[PDB]
């Protein structure tokens, strides 16, 4: 019946989810990947980025598929985040059943290749 | 490209999930319902209580089954929360496929009757 802790969680937008100082918001208003990235920025953010299984383990409980910021730019390149930031090793296991240059996040760190024009729900993220 | 908001989220235990001023924590260390309620209290809390689809809509994204504080006490009574607090109308849709006096929470406000002795993962909650 140990030392009770009690701390606030680093500024986040209003009514957003806060965890290990990262802010999340789950939008159910299905939109294509482009329209999707717009909403996030509109509220000053981007689509959910996966950078570490320790500070985002909550991510293991998400149900269904949702848009994240992983995209493939035909530069004869690899997959990356919409911000030019590099995907790191030992994080995501990617799945391919469709043709696409965008990806939906699935529970337990996995990316599903999906058409960027296909509407879907999405998750925005804002660090601190 | 509207008014950016930025607010902390009401004290919560350390590294817990914070949302609309309610604290959640997802434990993957499977235990029966009793052992389960003990952990939560141990950190000063109880198993996840559902009181409103507006302040707990995040709950719609939880995957799998998890222990919550809904139990049936044979007092020729109804289902209630471990704290004597009453379950309210128009919240949960209950499912029964097993014999039990405890319930697992399932995504989209639903309760599954389960044996209280059967181990399962659980979610603790602390209001503010």
């Amino acid at each position: 019946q140990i030392p009770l802790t009690e701390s606030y969680c680093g500024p986040c937008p209003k009514n957003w989810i806060c965890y290990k100082n990262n802010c999340y918001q789950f939008f159910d208003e299905s939109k294509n990947w482009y329209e999707s990235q717009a909403s996030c920025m509109s509220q000053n953010a981007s689509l959910l980025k996966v950078y570490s299984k320790e500070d985002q383990d909550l991510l293991k409980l998400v149900k269904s598929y949702h848009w994240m910021g992983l995209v493939h730019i035909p530069t004869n390149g690899s997959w990356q985040w919409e911000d030019g930031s590099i995907l790191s090793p030992n994080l995501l296991t990617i799945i391919e059943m469709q043709k696409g240059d965008c990806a939906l996040y699935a529970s337990s760190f996995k990316g599903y290749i999906e058409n960027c024009s296909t509407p879907n729900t999405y998750i925005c993220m804002q660090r601190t």
Side-chain angles (χ1 to χ4, degrees), chain A residues 1-126 128:
Chain A
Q1 302 188 355
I2 43 179
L4 320 176
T5 47
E6 219 64 84
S7 317
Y8 279 109
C9 187
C12 281
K14 179 90 184 189
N15 301 326
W16 274 42
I17 290 186
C18 196
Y19 181 72
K20 295 183 180 188
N21 296 318
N22 270 149
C23 316
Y24 309 87
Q25 192 61 327
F26 36 139
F27 294 75
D28 69 46
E29 260 87 30
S30 142
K31 307 176 189 180
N32 58 51
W33 188 101
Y34 305 111
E35 284 175 291
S36 187
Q37 178 58 184
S39 305
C40 300
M41 298 177 90
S42 164
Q43 303 176 65
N44 195 44
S46 5
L47 291 154
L48 143 71
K49 173 189 172 184
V50 177
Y51 70 95
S52 126
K53 300 199 196 155
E54 284 79 1
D55 302 327
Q56 294 172 302
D57 58 31
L58 54 2
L59 249 13
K60 304 201 96 221
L61 302 166
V62 192
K63 206 200 184 191
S64 224
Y65 304 87
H66 309 289
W67 278 139
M68 64 172 148
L70 196 71
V71 296
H72 170 202
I73 304 176
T75 84
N76 281 339
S78 320
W79 285 78
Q80 70 185 89
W81 301 104
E82 10 92 21
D83 69 12
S85 79
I86 131 146
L87 168 59
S88 269
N90 310 313
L91 302 193
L92 298 167
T93 298
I94 302 180
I95 318 311
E96 196 187 25
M97 319 250 165
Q98 206 164 284
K99 194 173 190 186
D101 292 298
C102 288
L104 299 157
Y105 168 82
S107 175
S108 224
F109 302 96
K110 272 140 24 56
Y112 285 87
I113 299 171
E114 177 103 350
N115 193 309
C116 302
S117 295
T118 296
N120 276 286
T121 54
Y122 58 97
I123 307 165
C124 298
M125 179 178 77
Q126 186 180 89
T128 52

